[PDB]
């Protein structure tokens, strides 16, 4: 507690591990989060630590056996209230209702972008939004997938995220005019959406692995991509691309 070895942990935490083992053979652990203590069988960071908040809530920190995953759970005096799982790569993921079911969930990516679900029901539906660098996409959640939607005029851009995180993008236009109706094709291999108007390609939208969006225009004849892809930094730039 001063006879101890310090171990760095995911989630900006540190745990102190005894060198000598306690009265009953196990190593004791001290990690300040409110100070939590516990006893484990290894002399690394792994183990379980308990504690009690000043408001009578009980805290349970579970450090993974390979030191790459902390699980911070907060209970009432018994019933889950919180469950933050932070990882070594800075990635982290909840609030519960009275029935012990998931009520909210925030997925923080390693790069800082977030995916927030609010008002989750028993069937699995709720309100969803993704926080990117510079703008926020909003949509819904279902037990099937996450759909984020951007509207401009009669055009609707839909970004779909499957359960495993696979991104696919759709576009629909309720415009009746063959001269102005936007259609699009999705190339999942290159993760690129090519928009077409009046049987000419107009622009490519690329949804990168860095959770960003780039736009590149074709020439007036729809023949060649021109210039270089420009990164989108504002929500109005997405709507402009959809005009």
């Amino acid at each position, epitope marked *: 507690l001063d006879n101890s070895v310090s171990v760095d942990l995911p989630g900006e935490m540190k745990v102190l591990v005894s060198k000598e083992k306690n009265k009953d053979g196990k190593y004791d652990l001290i990690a300040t989060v409110l100070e939590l203590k516990g006893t484990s069988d290894k002399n690394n960071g792994s183990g379980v630590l308990e504690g009690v908040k000043a408001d009578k809530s009980k805290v349970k920190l579970t450090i993974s056996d390979d030191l790459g995953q902390t699980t911070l759970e907060v209970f009432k005096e018994d019933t889950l209230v919180s469950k933050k799982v932070t990882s070594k790569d800075k990635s982290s993921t909840e609030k519960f209702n009275e029935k012990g079911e998931v009520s909210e969930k925030i997925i923080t990516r390693a790069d800082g972008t977030r995916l927030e679900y609010t008002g989750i029901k028993s069937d699995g539906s709720g309100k969803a939004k993704e926080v990117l660098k510079g703008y926020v996409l909003e949509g819904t959640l279902t037990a099937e997938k996450t759909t984020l939607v951007v509207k401009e005029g009669t055009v609707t851009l839909s970004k779909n995220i499957s359960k495993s995180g696979e991104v696919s993008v759709e576009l629909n236009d309720t415009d009746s005019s063959a001269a102005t109706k936007k259609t699009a094709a999705w190339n999942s291999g290159t993760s690129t959406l090519t928009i077409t108007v009046n049987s000419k390609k107009t622009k490519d939208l690329v949804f990168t692995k860095e959770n960003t969006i780039t736009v590149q225009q074709y*020439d007036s004849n729809g023949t*060649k991509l021109e*210039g270089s892809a420009v990164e989108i930094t504002k929500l109005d730039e997405i709507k402009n691309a959809l005009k």
Partner: antibody
Amino acid sequence: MQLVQSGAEVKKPGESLKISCKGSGYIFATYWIGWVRQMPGKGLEWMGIIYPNDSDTRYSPSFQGQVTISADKSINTAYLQWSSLKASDTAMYYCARTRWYFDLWGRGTLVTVSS
Amino acid sequence: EIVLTQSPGTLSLSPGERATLSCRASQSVSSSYLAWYQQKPGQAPRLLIYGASSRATGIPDRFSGSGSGTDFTLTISRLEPEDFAVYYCQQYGSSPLTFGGGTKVEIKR
């Protein structure tokens, strides 16, 4: 963004001529470059365009087979050349980035063909 | 080829006055792909408007374009001394690209 054209030319009929247009300040290879003729006291005429990255060349029917448009992508330059000049070729020749409207213009090359 | 006719050949107006220039095409211009240019003596042309009504970067908004199909208009809402020059229209809705014959805007006196 800029297009630099080569200097004024005074040639005799029958001579060959190649003029150039070098872009800077942007990715020259990924925008069409066009050529535009303006005869003395006259309006503008489109001659042709080239996409420098792959040398996709498209001429106006009024000039196809009369001039050759080319590009040296490695040095960001587009060219316009005649194999045999006539007095009727006396004009100002502009290059312009083509979108396919003309959004960036060079200052023009004055070509005088005379005996 | 789409022929572009510009009328009239010359506008005579005073500074501060409204200018209206006509560009008419022999066939309907696809997607209103119609551009306008300004040219002063001894200088290269300069893009003012593309897509019939979109203003190029840095061009003052006293220049506005409108129209569709075969009938297009360049309006200079209030003429400045530097606006008296020759103006050209150009269509890129079909190949080959073609220019109008130009309208000169001169000072009335």
